[PDB]
């Protein structure tokens, strides 16, 4: 199934864990986009005092991501594999809007979206859309249209703290290798060499100036308030 041309899909969801599907809420395109694009932004704090040659830079935030792509709808009859329909592209666009745009009275909002094509997998919200109608039948039925789309990114707050595995607050263990000293190991774990007598008391060490090269030590966290 390497030889199969895969087509892009969009599915709508009801919950923020993406496990409860909206009924009849799946869109499949008939022509793939040419390309897609991502955007990444990191913000810093850059205040400095006058008279100085450089500023003290501090990380502030990671801003949300962005995806963009374009679509083409056409039912003229020159693309192999598809049929000409009596009403053209009317039902294709109406089903596409029901999935990505329309307000849902069960959840009091528009839908959660999952976008999958090949290696790509993206969860989020619609922000912007433009649809332009190009060709028509003599009685006013449209047969060609072009759409531009912008998607934001969604992370649930319970999953953000699990991805930022934030760790002087937790407990730690190491094994002593030959070449280790107690004040150098304390500096790499706490940021300061001065806690070496508290690490030695918590492990029952008397001759801490010579460590034996199979010992497993504990490193307790610092106390708060």
């Amino acid at each position: 199934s390497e030889g199969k041309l895969e087509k892009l899909r969009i599915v709508a969801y009801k919950d923020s864990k993406f496990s409860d599907e909206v009924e009849n809420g799946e869109f499949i395109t008939l022509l793939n986009p040419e390309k897609y694009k991502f955007q990444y932004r990191v913000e810093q704090n850059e205040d400095q005092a006058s008279g100085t040659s450089s500023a003290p830079i501090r990380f502030n935030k990671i801003l949300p991501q962005t995806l963009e792509f374009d679509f083409l709808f056409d039912r003229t009859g020159v693309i192999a594999g598809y049929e000409v329909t009596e009403d053209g592209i009317i039902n294709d666009i109406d089903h596409f809007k029901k999935v990505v745009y329309d307000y849902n009275g069960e959840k009091h909002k528009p839908n959660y979206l999952m976008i999958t094509w090949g290696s790509l997998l993206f969860k989020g919200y619609l922000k912007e859309m433009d649809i332009e109608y190009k060709l028509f039948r003599p009685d006013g039925t449209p047969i060609r249209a072009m759409a531009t789309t912008k998607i934001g990114e969604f992370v649930e707050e319970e999953l953000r703290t699990a991805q930022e595995n934030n760790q002087p607050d937790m407990s730690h263990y190491r094994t002593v290798k030959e070449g280790d000293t107690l004040p150098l190991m304390t500096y790499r774990i706490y940021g300061d060499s001065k806690y070496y007598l508290e690490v030695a008391k918590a492990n029952g060490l008397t001759n801490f100036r010579r460590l034996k090269t199979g010992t497993e030590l504990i490193f307790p966290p610092l106390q708060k308030q």
Binding site: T76, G77, V78, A80
Partner: protein, 145 residues
């Protein structure tokens, strides 16, 4: 080959259009070729050449010529597309023939439809045959040999 073949003996056949012997005979056939679009890139530190990358395979339109035929099935098919936007693509075979009138080599032209139709100018002071010309768009071709 040891002695390569000449180019003046060939046949054009259509699939999806009612056959008539007068629609298989042509004066000239052209457009059986292909090319690859590329892009360039300059890598810093490499001063001997630029890099080139392929992007897409490209084919030209297929062009057929003959003397004017008034009851052609191919032309009726062309008119439906030209006048009413009714499009129904066809397949086509181009055959290069040997002395037993069997194919040396053939070209399989896939999913073709009409984009052009014309007849050359009339001139009261010249002795000439009326010539008709038809041009078709297609997706790709394959060869058998």
């Amino acid at each position: 080959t040891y002695y390569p073949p000449s180019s003046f003996h060939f046949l054009v056949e259509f699939t999806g259009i009612d056959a008539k012997n007068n629609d298989h005979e042509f004066q000239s056939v052209s457009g059986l070729s292909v090319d690859i679009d590329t892009e360039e890139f300059a890598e810093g530190g490499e001063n001997r050449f630029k890099h080139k990358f392929p992007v897409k395979t490209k084919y030209p339109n297929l062009v057929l010529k003959r003397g004017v035929l008034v009851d052609s099935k191919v032309i009726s098919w062309c008119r439906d597309a030209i006048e009413d936007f009714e499009f129904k693509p066809i397949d086509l075979t181009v055959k290069l023939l040997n002395e037993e009138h069997q194919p040396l080599m053939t070209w399989n032209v896939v999913h073709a439809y009409p984009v052009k139709w014309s007849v050359e100018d009339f001139n009261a002071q010249e002795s000439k045959m009326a010539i008709e010309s038809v041009e078709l768009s297609y997706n790709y071709f394959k060869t058998i040999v």
